[PDB]
Amino acid sequence: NRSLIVTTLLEEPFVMFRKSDRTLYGNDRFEGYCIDLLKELAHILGFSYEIRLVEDGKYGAQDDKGQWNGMVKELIDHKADLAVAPLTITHVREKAIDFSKPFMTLGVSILYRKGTPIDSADDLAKQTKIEYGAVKDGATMTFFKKSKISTFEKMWAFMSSKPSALVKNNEEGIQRTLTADYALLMESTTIEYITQRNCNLTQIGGLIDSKGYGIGTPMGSPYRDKITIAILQLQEEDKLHIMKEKWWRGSGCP
Numbered sequence: 001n002r003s004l005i006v007t008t009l010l011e012e013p014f015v016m017f018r019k020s021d022r023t024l025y026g027n028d029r030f031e032g033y034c035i036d037l038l039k040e041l042a043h044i045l046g047f048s049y050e051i052r053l054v055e056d057g058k059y060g061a062q063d064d065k066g067q068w069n070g071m072v073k074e075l076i077d078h079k080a081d082l083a084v085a086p087l088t089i090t091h092v093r094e095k096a097i098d099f100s101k102p103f104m105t106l107g108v109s110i111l112y113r114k115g116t117p118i119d120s121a122d123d124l125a126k127q128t129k130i131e132y133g134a135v136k137d138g139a140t141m142t143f144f145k146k147s148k149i150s151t152f153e154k155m156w157a158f159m160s161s162k163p164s165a166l167v168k169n170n171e172e173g174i175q176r177t178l179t180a181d182y183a184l185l186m187e188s189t190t191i192e193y194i195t196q197r198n199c200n201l202t203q204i205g206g207l208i209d210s211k212g213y214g215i216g217t218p219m220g221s222p223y224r225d226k227i228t229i230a231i232l233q234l235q236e237e238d239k240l241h242i243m244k245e246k247w248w249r250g251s252g253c254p
């Protein structure tokens with residue numbers, strides 16, 4: 001009956017500061033695919049919300065003692081009711097929080113400058129001249145850390161010995177690919193957005209795995225089921241496809 005606390009972080013084109021001459025405040029500060037999604041869920045389900053940026057700016061991972069951070073920790077501590085963001089649904093996380101059914105499907109792939117004609121992950125793993133890494137404390141990093149696939153094991157070994165291989169966020173990571181001989185391990189629908197706008201960057205290879213984004217909730221949340229059905233209904237009508245086209249719609253690359 002109360003407004004729901006929504007945790008998030010800034011990530012183009014999912015959650016961004018809207019442009020204005022005015023100083024903005026409250027929910028009005030934000031726009032993007034997840035905000036559009038949040039509005040539709042709120043309309044369909046009849047709830048209100050207050051959006052808050054997660055203080056540590058992280059999605060969430062476990063430390064050596066097994067303690068979480070990021071939005072995942074916000075849910076665990078019940079400081080937020082929902083995590084509305086491009087939050088990857090993973091089995092390791094389902095151990096701490098719950099998820100709606102996925103609202104978007106994606107996979108891990110490679111972002112790299114057009115040039116050295118690498119064609120796959122295997123090529124990166126067998127060398128060190130081209131450094132590579134991932135966003136710290138995100139799903140992609142954790143995927144590598146936990147993998148039993150020989151190649152990805154080789155990659156994690158490399159990433160974790162190399163001090164700045166793992167970057168604070170996408171913005172930092174993308175910049176590194178543009179200024180250093182560096183490849184970023186990143187999620188594919190994001191790679192898609194970036195390579196349409198940065199014509200010297202490209203995706204290398206295809207998708208190495210396949211997973212989903214979902215809305216996070218505290219374990220046992222009373223909103224989770226209701227969110228899932230609304231999401232399912234949005235997909236049936238191709239609305240999430242249309243919504244994506246809206247925010248990915250950009251000026252192409254020769």
Ligand SMILES: CNC(=O)CC[C@H](C[C@H](N)C(=O)O)C(=O)O
Pocket residue numbers: 011059060086087088089135137138139140141170185186187190
């Ligand atoms: C769409 N957001 C990003 O690419 C930022 C980092 C992401 C965050 C990831 N979806 C996660 O849930 O931890 C990643 O680790 O690949």
Ligand SMILES: [Cl-]
Pocket residue numbers: 051052053
């Ligand atoms: Cl905030």
Ligand SMILES: [K+]
Pocket residue numbers: 019020021022023024
């Ligand atoms: K402003």
Ligand SMILES: [K+]
Pocket residue numbers: 001002003047048
């Ligand atoms: K209300």
